[PDB]
Amino acid sequence: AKKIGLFYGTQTGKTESVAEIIRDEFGNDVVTLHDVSQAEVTDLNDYQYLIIGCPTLNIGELQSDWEGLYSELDDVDFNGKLVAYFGTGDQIGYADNFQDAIGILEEKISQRGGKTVGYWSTDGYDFNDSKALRNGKFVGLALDEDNQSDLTDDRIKSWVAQLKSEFGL
Ligand SMILES: Cc1cc2nc3c(=O)[nH]c(=O)nc-3n(C[C@H](O)[C@H](O)[C@H](O)COP(=O)(O)O)c2cc1C
Fold first, then answer.
1. 1-169 sits in which CATH class?
2. Pocket-forming residues, ligand 1, beta carbon under 6 Å
3. Whole-number Å distance between alpha carbons of 52 and 163
4. What is the spatial distance between Cα 91 and Cα 25, in angstroms, rounded to a whole number?
5. Terminal C-alpha separation, the chain
6. Burial class (CB in 10 A: 0-12, 13-18, 19+), 140
7. Nearest CA to ligand 1 atom 2
8. Which of 83, 91, 76 shows the shortest CA–CA distance to 139?
């Protein structure tokens, strides 16, 4: 399999659009996209580097497909793997639950052995609370296509450059 496995869930396609851009930034040959509606938890075993994408929905909840796989994460050993996270959200409409989903996923995957890389600054965002906070930084890249779609491309560019360094790729 390719070097990096990017597993994402999506309802209206924004998380998928972001996933495609992330793939392009790394290079089409480095990343393989996996929509978790079609994935099995065991597919995560095929990669030494993982990128987890998920929108926060219905006020602080995981996207449905990730919700389903979450329950089976206990069946996977992430030890030895480096994992990064990106989330889509709306900081204005859900200021108290901005990017909660990636925080929820990282908490579980880290417990299962996955080492987190890709922490992201909170500068440039206006929100009140988030389960994705770790020492003042988001556990991963935060995109907001509802209010800051004009910032997404450059944010991904910067984040991918960071991940190449942290992944050692
Ligand atoms: C009913 C509903 C609830 C939402 N709840 C949250 C939330 O709690 N936190 C957040 O950051 N974004 C929230 N959002 C915003 C979505 O995460 C955002 O629009 C995202 O880009 C959608 O991605 P998708 O197109 O991949 O589904 C919500 C959107 C809808 C329509």
1. alpha beta
2. 10-15, 55-60, 88-90, 94, 97-100, 145-146
3. 13
4. 25
5. 15
6. buried
7. 58
8. 83
Measured distance CA(130)–CA(18) in Å, rounded:
20
Solved by what technique? X-ray
Atom of ligand 1 at shortest range from CA of 8 = 26
- Delimit the domains of the chain by residue range: 1-169
CB 56 within 8 A of CB 97: yes
**DSSP of 48-94, one letter per residue?**
SEEEEEEEEETTTEE-HHHHHHHTTGGG---TT-EEEEEEE--TTTT
Entry field: residues in the chain? 169
Q: What is the resolution of this structure in A?
A: 1.2
Atom of ligand 1 nearest to the CA of 55: 17
C-alpha 56 to ligand 1 mean position (Å): 5
Sheet strands side by side (includes 137-138): 120-121, 137-138, 133-134
- d(CA 79, ligand 1 centre) in Å: 30
CA 92 to centroid of ligand 1, rounded, Å: 11
